[PDB]
DNA sequence: AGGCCGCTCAATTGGTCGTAGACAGCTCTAGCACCGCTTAAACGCACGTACGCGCTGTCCCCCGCGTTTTAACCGCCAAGGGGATTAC
DNA sequence: TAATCCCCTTGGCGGTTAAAACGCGGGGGACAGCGCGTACGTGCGTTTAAGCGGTGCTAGAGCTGTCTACGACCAATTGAGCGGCCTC
C-alpha cells in the first residue's frame, strides 16, 4: 500500500447526504472543497493566533474562534455560524 | 449625548484639502457626499473590527493598537502608533 | 481692479501647498465626535484614546488620498480633470469593493 | 473497564472530525493550548459553511438538470453569494469558468 | 450569398460561450514549453509535473480574466468598447502593481 | 537543448478567446503583445517563488503543491490542487 | 569559574539583539524549535534594511537642511525607492504626506 | 510604579550614528521605525513558519529564513541581504 | 596554559591577512611604530576594493558567457569605471587589450 | 629543496567566492590582482609615511590611513571605505 | 525636545544536558522525459465589411475663486471619575 | 477575578480668529453630433505543430534504517538596555 493521507471526502459526503441525499459529487469538486476547508481552517486558525497574541493569551478558546468568525465571516453568515457553533458547544458541553 | 450629523463634521473644505493632498485639481459637486459615504463605510469596517477587539479584550476604551490590527486586517497597515 | 488669478492657479497652489504639508486636513473635534457617533451605534458608551482618534484620522486621510490617486489616474484615463464619483466607484470596484 | 469510546463529532451531533481539527490546531502553531470549545466551535462553523455551499451546489446542479456536483456549479453558487463572494474574493476555482457577466453597454439595442 | 455575421456578433457569442464554458483556452504543450524555457532561465534542466503545469495554467487564465474584467471596467469608464494597453497598465497600477 | 521562444505559444486566438471569457468585445492589435508581456512578468514572479520553494525542497522535479504555496503567497489562491 | 559575558549580537558584530529576536521568534509560535542560523540571519537582514533606510533618511534630511529625521523624510525615503515601494505598497506612514507628484496634464500650457 | 515597554530605540540610534554621526532623530520617526521592524519581522517570520510547514520542518533554520528572504524581499535587496547574511553567519560560526 | 588564538583577520572577520599587512607595513620603512587601527583599516579598504572589482570581473565574465575571469574582463572593468580609472590612469595591464572605442568620425556615414 | 614565495592567493579567492561563488580564476589575472594589491598597498603606505612626517607623528594609526583614503581615492568608494573601516574598527574593538 | 546621562531591571546567554529532527544514504518504482505515429484541431493570413476612437467647434454649465461673516474651533483652565492596569 | 489608583480620559467654560460658510462674476470642463481617417472582428481555406494514443526508461520522487549534529531549557550572572530628566 501507500501512506494514508487525510482528506475531507467522507465528512463532505456525510454533510452532502444531510443536505442533498439524491445527488452525486465529482472528485474535482471534492478536492476543491478540501482546499476550501483547509484554507478557511488556516485563515481562522491564524486569526485566532493573532488575537491570542493581541490579548496575550496562551490558549485559544471558542471565545477567540467566535471573535475570528465575527471578524472574517460577514453578517448573517457570521451570526448563524454563531448560532450553530453555540448550539453545538451546548450539545457537546452536555455531551 | 447622542450624536446625529457629525459626518458633516468632516467639512467640505477638509475634503478639498484632502483632494489637494491627493493631487485633484477640479472637484465635482457630487464628490463630497460620495467621499463621506465611502469614508463612513471604511470607518465602520475598521471600528467594527476595533469594537470586536475591545469587547474580546473586555475593555471599554478604544485603543490605537486595535486600530493598528484592524487596518492590518484590511491590508492598510499603518506605521507610527506603537506598532 | 483687485488681483484675480485664473481658475486652477490657486488650485495648483493648493496642490503644491498640501503635498509639501504633512499636517492633518481634518478638524480634530468633529472627527472625534463622528467616530464616537458611529461607534455608539455599534457599542454604547465607547471611549476613545485621542491618539487612537488621531490614528483613525491619519489612516482615513491617507486612505482617501490613495483613493484619489486612483481616482485621478482614472480621470486622466477618462480624459477629465473634474473628477466625478463614478471615478471613485471605478477605483473601488476594480480594487474589489 | 473503559466505557464506549464515543466520537466527539457525534457528541457535538456533527460530522466534521473534532479529533482532526484539534490535532491540527495543536500541530499548526497557533497556541500550544486550544480551548475545549474552540475546535468544536470551529468545526461547527466549517460544517455550517460546508452544508450551505453543498446545498447551493446541489440546487445549482438541479438548475442545470445535473445530479453530480461540478466545479462549474461551485463557481455559479459561491460567486453568486455576495458574502461568500467577499469571503472568497481572491480565490480561484480550477475549471470553474466564470460567472456569466455581460455588461449592459456591451449588449445591443 | 454566403452567410456573414456583423462585427461583435461572433464576439458576443464567444463571450456567452466561454462564460458558459469552463475549459482552458490556451494550448497546453506550448504553455508547458514556455514553463520549461522560463524555468531554465532560473534553473536549468528542471522537470515539471503535468499537474503543476495545469495548476499554473488555470492560475494564468484566471489572473488574465481578472485583468480583462478590470480592463473592461476601465474601457467603459473611458466610454469605450475597444481596449487599448493604457487600460491594462492603468488597471495594473490600480491593483498596486 | 534550450528553448528561445514559447511565449508565442500563448497564441493570439487564445488571448482572443480569454478576452471573450474576460468579456472584451473588441481587442486592439496592440493588446496581445503587452498582455503577453504582463503575463510573462506574472509567470516569472510565480515561477521564481516556485523555484525558490523547489530548491528549498531539495527537489529537481517541480510539483503543483509549491505552485499552490506561491500563488497563495501572491494573493491568488487557487482551489483544486492543494494536497 | 564562569565564562565572560560576550553577547551573540557582538558575535555577529551587529547592533540588533540576537537574544531578543530569537525569543520573539520562539514566542511568536512559528516553530517550537528554530535553527541557529535563522535569528542571526534575520537580524543581519533587518539591520541591513534599516541601514539603507538610515542613509535614505540621512540624505533626505541633508537635502532639507535639517540634521534631524522627520517622517516627511521617511515618506520621501520610502516612496522614492522601487524595491522599498514593492516592500511597502500597502503601508501607511504617520504624518508623511505624499510624494511631490503632479500629473503633466495639471500644468499650464 | 511603572512597567517596562521594550522598543528598538537604542539599536536604531546606534546604526544611525554608525552611518550618520551628525544626523538627528525625532521620536515619531522612531515610532515608524519600530512599526517597520515589527511589521517586517512578522512578515518574514510568518513566511518562515509557512516554509517550515510546507517542507514538514519542525525547525526554522538559516535555509528557511533565507528562503523567506528570496520570497518576500524583492531583487537587489535580497541578494545584498544574502551577502551580509552569509558573511554574518560565517563570522558567527567563527565566533 | 594558553588562550586559543584567533587571527586578527578573524577578529575583524575580514579575509585579508591582518598579520601580513601589519608586518609588511612595519618592515616597509614608513614608520617604526604603527597604530592598531591602521593595518586593519587598510586591510578593510583593500578587501572592499578587491571585492568590488571582483564583482565587476564576475558579472563582466557572465556577460561574455565565460565562467572564469580573464584580464580582458579586468580591462573592461577598470576602463569602464570612472573612479577606478582615476585610481589607475597610468597603470598598464598585461594582456588586457583596450576598450572597444571607435571615434564618431571613424564610423561610416 | 625550494623556498616559499608568498602571494595574496587564497584571500582574493575567498572574497571572489564570496561575491561570485561560481566564477573561476585565470592565474595571470591573479598575478594582476597581486600586483594591484601591492601597488595600492605601497601607495597608501607611502601616503601614511608622508602624513606621519608632516604631522611629526612617529606612529601611524587609523586616522592617517583614513586621511590617505580621503586623499587618493576620490569620493564615493572612499566614503564607502570609511564606512566598512569604521564598522571594522568598531567590531575589532568589540572583539 | 534630543539626547544625554545617571538609575534600575529583566534579559541574555554559557555549560551542560537529554532528546528528537532531519540530513545523508539508498533502493525502487512510477511517472517525467524521450521517441516515433497518425489526425484533424490549430493557425494564421490575406481579404474585403462594417465599426471604433477620440477630436473641431460649440454649448451649456459647473465649480474655483475671492473676499465677508460667523459661530464654533482652538488653545487654555479647572473638575470628575472610569477604567486600565497591575500585583495577588 | 476582587481592587484600585492614578492617570488618562470626558464633560464644562471664558475668548479666537481659523475655519467654516456664502453668494458672484467667470473662466474652464465635459462632452455629444457628426464627419473622418481607420483599426480590427470575421468567412474561411491551410499548415503544422498540437492533440491522441503508444512505448522503452531512468532521474529523481518517494520511502526507509541511521546517526549525529542541534537546538531548547534551568539556576545564574551579567552588561546592555530601558523607565527618567532636563536642558540647550
Looking at this protein, list some descriptive labels.
part of a larger assembly; 10 chains; A: about 100 residues; mainly alpha; C: about 100 residues; 2 strands; DNA-binding
What's the helix and strand layout?
The structure is cut from a larger assembly and holds three copies of chain A (95 residues), two copies of chain B (83 residues), two copies of chain C (97 residues) and three copies of chain D (109 residues).
Chain B: H1 12-21, E1 26-27, H2 31-56, E2 61-62, H3 64-73, E3 78-79
Chain C: H1 9-20, H2 28-42, E1 47-48, H3 50-77, E2 82-83, H4 85-95
Chain D: H1 8-11, H2 18-27, E1 33-34, H3 37-63, E2 68-69, H4 71-78, H5 82-87, E3 92-93
Chain E binds a DNA duplex (88 and 88 nucleotides) through α1, α2 and β1.
Describe this structure in words.
It is classed as dna binding protein. The entry lists the keywords Chromatin, Linker Histone, DNA binding protein. The entry is titled "Nucleosome stack of the 4x197 nucleosome array containing H1". Chains A, H, J: Histone H2B type 1-K. The organism of A, H, J is Homo sapiens. The structure is cut from a larger assembly and holds 3 copies of chain A (95 residues), 2 copies of chain B (83 residues), 2 copies of chain C (97 residues) and 3 copies of chain D (109 residues). Chain A has 95 residues and is mainly α. Chain A has 4 helices and 2 strands; from the N terminus they run αβαβαα. In chain A, helix 2 packs across helix 3 (62-72) and helix 3 runs antiparallel to helix 4 (75-93). Chain B has one domain: Histone, subunit A (Orthogonal Bundle). Helix content of chain B is 55%, strand content 7%. Chain B has helices at 12-21, 31-56, 64-73; strands spanning 26-27, 61-62, 78-79. Chain B is globular. Chain C is extended and about 50 Å long. Chain C has one domain. Chain D has helices at residues 8-11, 18-27, 37-63, 71-78, 82-87, and strands spanning 33-34, 68-69, 92-93. Chain E binds a DNA duplex (88 and 88 nucleotides) through residues 2-11, 27-30, 47-50, 78-82, 84.
Number of domains of chain A: 1
Count of individual helical segments of chain B: 3
Instruction: Give the strand content of chain B.
Output: 5-15%
Name the pair of protein chains with the most residues at their interface, and give those residue counts: A-D, 59 and 58 residues
The tally of helices of chain A reads: 4
Radius of gyration of chain A, in angstroms, nearest whole number:
16 Å
**What CATH architecture label of chain A applies?**
Orthogonal Bundle
Fraction of helical residues of chain A = over 70%
CATH class of chain A: Mainly Alpha
Shape of chain A: globular
**Which architecture of chain B does the CATH hierarchy give at level 2?**
Orthogonal Bundle
- The quaternary structure here is part of a larger assembly
Biggest sheet of chain B, in brief? none
Organism (chains A, H, J): Homo sapiens
Family (chains A, H, J): Belongs to the histone H2B family.
Main location (chains A, H, J): nucleus
Keywords (chains A, H, J): Acetylation, ADP-ribosylation, Antibiotic, Antimicrobial, Chromosome, DNA-binding, Glycoprotein, Hydroxylation, Isopeptide bond, Methylation, Nucleosome core, Nucleus, Phosphoprotein, Ubl conjugation
Amino acid at each position: 500500500k501507500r501512506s494514508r493521507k487525510e482528506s475531507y471526502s467522507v465528512y463532505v459526503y456525510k454533510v452532502l447526504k444531510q443536505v442533498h441525499p439524491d445527488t452525486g459529487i465529482s472528485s474535482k469538486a471534492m478536492g476543491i472543497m478540501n482546499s476550501f476547508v483547509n484554507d478557511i481552517f488556516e485563515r481562522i486558525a491564524g486569526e485566532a493566533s493573532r488575537l491570542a497574541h493581541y490579548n496575550k493569551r496562551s490558549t485559544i478558546t471558542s471565545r477567540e474562534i467566535q471573535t475570528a468568525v465575527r471578524l472574517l465571516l460577514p453578517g448573517e453568515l457570521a451570526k448563524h455560524a454563531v448560532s450553530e457553533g453555540t448550539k453545538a458547544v451546548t450539545k457537546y458541553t452536555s455531551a | 449625548k447622542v450624536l446625529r450629523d457629525n459626518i458633516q463634521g468632516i467639512t467640505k473644505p477638509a475634503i478639498r484639502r484632502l483632494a489637494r493632498r491627493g493631487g485633484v485639481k477640479r472637484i465635482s459637486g457630487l464628490i463630497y457626499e460620495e467621499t463621506r459615504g465611502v469614508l463612513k463605510v471604511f470607518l465602520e469596517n475598521v471600528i467594527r473590527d476595533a469594537v470586536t477587539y475591545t469587547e474580546h479584550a473586555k475593555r471599554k476604551t478604544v485603543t490605537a493598537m486595535d486600530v493598528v490590527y484592524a487596518l492590518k486586517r484590511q491590508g492598510r497597515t499603518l506605521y507610527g502608533f506603537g506598532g | 481692479k483687485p488681483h484675480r488669478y485664473r481658475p486652477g492657479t490657486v488650485a495648483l497652489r493648493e496642490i503644491r501647498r498640501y503635498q509639501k504639508s504633512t499636517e492633518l486636513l481634518i478638524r480634530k473635534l468633529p472627527f472625534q465626535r463622528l467616530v464616537r457617533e458611529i461607534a455608539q451605534d455599534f457599542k454604547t458608551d465607547l471611549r476613545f484614546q485621542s491618539s487612537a482618534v488621531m490614528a483613525l484620522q491619519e489612516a482615513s486621510e491617507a486612505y482617501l488620498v490613495g483613493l484619489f490617486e486612483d481616482t485621478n489616474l482614472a480621470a486622466i484615463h477618462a480624459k477629465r480633470v473634474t473628477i466625478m464619483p463614478k471615478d471613485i466607484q471605478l477605483a473601488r470596484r476594480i480594487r474589489g469593493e | 473497564a473503559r466505557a464506549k469510546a464515543k466520537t466527539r463529532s457525534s457528541r457535538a451531533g456533527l460530522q466534521f472530525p473534532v479529533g482532526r481539527v484539534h490535532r491540527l490546531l495543536r500541530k499548526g502553531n497557533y497556541s500550544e493550548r486550544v480551548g475545549a470549545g474552540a475546535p468544536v466551535y470551529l468545526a461547527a462553523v466549517l460544517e455550517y459553511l460546508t452544508a450551505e455551499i453543498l446545498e447551493l451546489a446541489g440546487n445549482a446542479a438541479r438548475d442545470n438538470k445535473k445530479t453530480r456536483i461540478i466545479p462549474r456549479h461551485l463557481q455559479l453558487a459561491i460567486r453568486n453569494d455576495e458574502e461568500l463572494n467577499k469571503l472568497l474574493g481572491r480565490v480561484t476555482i480550477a475549471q470553474g469558468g466564470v460567472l456569466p457577466n455581460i455588461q449592459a453597454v456591451l449588449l445591443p439595442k
